[PDB]
Amino acid sequence: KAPPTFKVSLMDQSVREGQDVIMSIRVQGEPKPVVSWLRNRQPVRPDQRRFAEEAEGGLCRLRILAAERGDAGFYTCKAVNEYGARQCEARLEVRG
Amino acid sequence: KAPPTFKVSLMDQSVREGQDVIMSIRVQGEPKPVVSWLRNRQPVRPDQRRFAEEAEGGLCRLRILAAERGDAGFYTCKAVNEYGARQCEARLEVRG
């Protein structure tokens, strides 16, 4: 049993408009943490060009297809399980 | 011959995340004005879920598919021809 911890945390990025973005973390914890994503402290609502993925080894990703200036902001990854909670944050900037 | 004028101008809107947005203007002028779109004074870069359209009678539209919080901002429609320039603006807000 273990509360959530981040083995890989978010880091700032600056992309050009039209480029895809990936934000990746690696979380540990038992039971497996529930991982959710915020932009400017609001839930990230998925759509065809922005969505969350879970991969093996605790990898969790937020994918944005063809970045727009409005994607810029502060992104938070929240992790929760029965034994605690943890979060990390980074900034996405978008250039012309 | 005539400089650009707006017969129908932008107006503020507040949509829910996931809803489509249309911003419409009707421009007059001869030669036909060149119409371009800005968000927060930056060019709107088109992609599959955001693009500009021109229809008959001088109708010009900006379409956003499945609005996201980051689409919120102040949108400007710029019109230019050989005889002058005009612009109008409105705000888009996005609710959960």
Residue numbers in the entry:
A (entry chain A), B (entry chain A): 17 to 112
Quote the authors verbatim.
Only one cysteine of this bridge is present in ΔAPEG-1 and no disulfide linkages were found. An average dimer dissociation constant of Kd = 20 μM derived from the concentration-dependent Mw measurements was obtained for both full-length APEG-1 and ΔAPEG-1 at 100 mM NaCl, demonstrating the nearly identical amount of dimers.
The recently discovered Aortic Preferentially Expressed Protein-1 (APEG-1) may serve as a sensitive marker for vascular SMC differentiation. The amino acid sequence of APEG-1 (SwissProt Q15772) defines a single Ig-like domain.
